[PDB]
Amino acid sequence: TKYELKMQYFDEWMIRWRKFQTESDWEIEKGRQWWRRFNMAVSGALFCGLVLYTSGTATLKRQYGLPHFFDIGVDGQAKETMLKTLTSRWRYTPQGYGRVLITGVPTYILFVTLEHYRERRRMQQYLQQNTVFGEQMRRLLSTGKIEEYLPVNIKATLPASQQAIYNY
């Protein structure tokens, strides 16, 4: 299922009618932002791990060998530990297109999958909302069209000092 094609209209409408954004919807969007950052972080960690695993033995020896920039003693211990751990076993160390694929395809797949399912999660969250945004989301998934000026049609709540327009 392709949720982005449905959700782009809803997001544009929300931006156009952001005045009726309750704090719950704002929290939903903040959670989406946080999960995007988390997905980026984990995908980057996976990419770094794949790059390190596929790195050449000479490359690792140069990177995790002498000299030590700080020379505190913990730095050398950590570098030696990582170097021994990597160089102990045999590692498949491709170069060129192969390393590109091995390092990138898993990262792209992970990031895309996480983001897609978080988009589905956000769609469900907006479906469960009891606000005008949630009603718009439900109407969008039902009729397939975004109904603009919905907040003023169904008379969504307004501040006490702005209810004169509804006075009819």
Partner 1 sequence: MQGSWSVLKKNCSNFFPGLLAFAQQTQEAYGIWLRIYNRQQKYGPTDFVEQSETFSPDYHKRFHSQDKNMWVDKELCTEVSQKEVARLMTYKLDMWRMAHCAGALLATGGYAIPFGLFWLANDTWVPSSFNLTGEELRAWREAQDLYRYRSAPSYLTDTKWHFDFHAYPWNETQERAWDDLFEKNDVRRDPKVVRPAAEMYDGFIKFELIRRKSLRHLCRSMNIPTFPMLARLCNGTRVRDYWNLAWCEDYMVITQRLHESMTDEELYDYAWRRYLAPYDKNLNREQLMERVEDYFEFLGPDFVAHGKAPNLVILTNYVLGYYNDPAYLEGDISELDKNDYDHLASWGKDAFLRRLEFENGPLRDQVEAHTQRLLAERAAIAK
Partner 2 sequence: SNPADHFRPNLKALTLYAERQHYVDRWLHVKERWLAPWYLPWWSPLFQLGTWYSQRSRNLFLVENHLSYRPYKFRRNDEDRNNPY
Partner 3 sequence: GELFVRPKLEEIPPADQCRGFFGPLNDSLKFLRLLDIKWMMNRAVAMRREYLIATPTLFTFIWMFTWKGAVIYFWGDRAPPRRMDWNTEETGRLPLGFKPTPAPL
Ligand X SMILES: CCCCCCCCCCCCCCCCCC(=O)OC[C@H](COP(=O)([O-])OCC(O)COP(=O)([O-])OC[C@@H](COC(=O)CCCCCCCCCCCCCCCCC)OC(=O)CCCCCCCCCCCCCCCCC)OC(=O)CCCCCCCCCCCCCCCCC
Ligand Y SMILES: CCCCCCCCCCCCO[C@@H]1O[C@H](CO)[C@@H](O[C@H]2O[C@H](CO)[C@@H](O)[C@H](O)[C@H]2O)[C@H](O)[C@H]1O
- 100-119 footprint of ligand X as x/- string (CB under 6 A): xxxxxxxxxxxx--------
With CB under 8 A as the contact rule, the residue among 40, 41, 58, 141 that binds partner 1 is: 58
| Residue 102 burial by Cβ neighbours in a 10 Å radius (0-12, 13-18, 19+) | middle
Provide, rounded to whole angstroms, the least separation between the CB of residue 39 and partner 3. 22
**Whole-number Cα distances in Å, 113 to 30, 35, 116, 118, 162:** 20, 13, 5, 9, 44
Provide, rounded to whole angstroms, the least separation between the CB of residue 30 and partner 2. 6
Judge contact between 123 and 7, C-beta under 8 A: yes
Given partner 3, partner 2, partner 1, none, residue 91, with its beta carbon under 5 to 8 Å by kind, binds none
Distance CA 96, CA 92 (A): 13
Question: Under the rule (CB under 8 A), what is the footprint of partner 3?
Answer: 19-23, 25, 66-73, 127-128, 130-135, 138-139, 141-142, 154-160
